[PDB]
Amino acid sequence: MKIAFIGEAVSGFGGMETVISNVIHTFENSSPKINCEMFFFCRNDKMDKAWLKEIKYAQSFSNIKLSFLRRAKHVYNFSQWLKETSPDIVICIDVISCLYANKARKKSGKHFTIFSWPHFSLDHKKHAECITYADYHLAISSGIKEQIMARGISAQDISVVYNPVSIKTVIVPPPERDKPAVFLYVGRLKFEGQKRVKDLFDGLARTTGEWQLHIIGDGSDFEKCQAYSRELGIEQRVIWYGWQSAPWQVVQQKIKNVTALLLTSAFEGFPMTLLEAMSYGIPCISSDCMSGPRDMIKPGLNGELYTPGAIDDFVGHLNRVISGEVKYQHDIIPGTIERFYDVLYFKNFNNAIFSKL
Template sequence: MKNINQKSDNYRAELFLMGGTEDQNWVQDLPYTSCVPAKKNKLLQQLEKFSSILQYLKKEKPSMVISVDTKLIRVCQLCRHFIKPKFPIVSWIHFSLFNEPLVNTKLLPYADNHLCISSGIAKQMKSLGIHHSNLYVIYNPISYIEKIVPRPQGTTKFIYIGRVQMERQKRLQDLLTALSQVDGNWHLDVYGDGEDADSCKRLSEKLGIYDQITWHGWVDNAWKSIHEATALLLTSAYEGLPMVLAEAISRGVYCISSDCQTGPEDLIQDGINGELYQPGNLKQLQSILQSVVTGKELPDQRSMKESIQFMYANSYYAHLQRDFARILDKWNAK
């Protein structure tokens, strides 16, 4: 939001935080208003929330309201009946729609337009009956950095960055099982922690690959600790837009990822910056990993960095402002 305010003379963005925030660091220097309901009774809480949003919208007279919460989409739509001038309501969901319990897909049609962080989410929106003309695929921004993480010589270094989950979303079980069938000189560095960390370590021991893995635990800004890497691995069952892939590609690191819903297909171009495998197809994953270990020629790292040009900040915010203008033009033409 800070970038929107800094990079545009046409738009001023402000946050409304229902329930407030425990971590004040991320809202430093951001214009925001928060509401923490005082009532303990659930019905009274809902009325208090509705009243606070209604009063806020009446006061601010927004040109557009963007919501990352499906429940608040409906609340804003109800509030709009009591406010002039009217404004478009835009959803901005950051998860795969059918895998996140917090997303109530029945409430999405109450938004007039939808910002989609991946083409997969746009497809999911269409499957709900939302017209393609109301969908805007914008992705997420990433900073351009000059640094390239060099590839090690004489060995293969795989890296994993994220929550450590045996199954569920991240499926480290698939990663460890596939790696256990890869011959040659390789090592895996795991940056992240989670409730299944001990279970994953025990599985790696059972599979006979424990000594080929370094479990770093949670590391603040893992990329500062990564000095060499051959490829980043992602075995997720689902995502929204896995920014860890973009972070890797922006540093010239090859990516091997499941082609899960949603996001990887937008970032990985086969033979250009990485490879995709079908989720759950461990034989295919093992074959890809083996080809890298046995010396498959990987793409030029600087060309890889350029392959996600559309996500770098300057391109991203120019695209976002164009979509804001399109949404407002369409609304004002009604």
């Protein structure tokens, strides 16, 4: 069997890329080999090729300003590629690519199964309706599955495959008895928009008990965030690390003890940071946003979810963790994300693919 992984050109530095490469490496090492190639739809050659080290790939280039012509070109090139290569399976890492795959199948006269495998909420990205051009669907979240179903797709044609994270051999413990609560934020800083650091700040200012917040990340809104903190009179409780290549090394070496990681986003493509935290035994308090903190967080066991906008609920969650009214056992939290760990994840993924054939 041969699998083609196809998509629009990406930066080459994202988590998605990493997951893809990992999957391909796992596949081409399953049997003697299963054989994986990639095909990219590009307006330029800006994509970094580092992540495509041991990956066989081809590219379709079109910078025609009329989208219709561009898409026509893309479909043509991918048909040609199909004719050349003859894949058994085509997996589309974005929604437009499903369209391309379907048209190209018709054009090329080649027989293969098309799987969707989007890495972002359909409702927060362009070309959502193109999802319907795939035969079957690989959903990284329940929210994505829901979105897919809303466009008329049967639940039986969608497998929730989640996303992978590495097993860790260290636990980040909570602060010792009668030490202040230690909260962690890891990600790009946006005051409002997607990330709503403003919400984080407001909830922490409303909490009862002694706490400290460690912020790993930066962005244009850094200054604004700082200002807001000052306004709220919480500036002395916030520690800023800026951008960090290895946030978890910082956490281990500098912070050492963590009560919870907090995420207050309006929406998320996939909150890998939460997963990472849980793999180190850190409980997570997150907005129940699209998508899917609700796939990772088990309320009362490895953290909490609050309804979008429900800052009172968030505050309540914070207060209970600070007081110990609710206790999360760091030593068992890594076991609560069993289905996300590399090997099991890949098993599930493979099953989702070959179960539909």
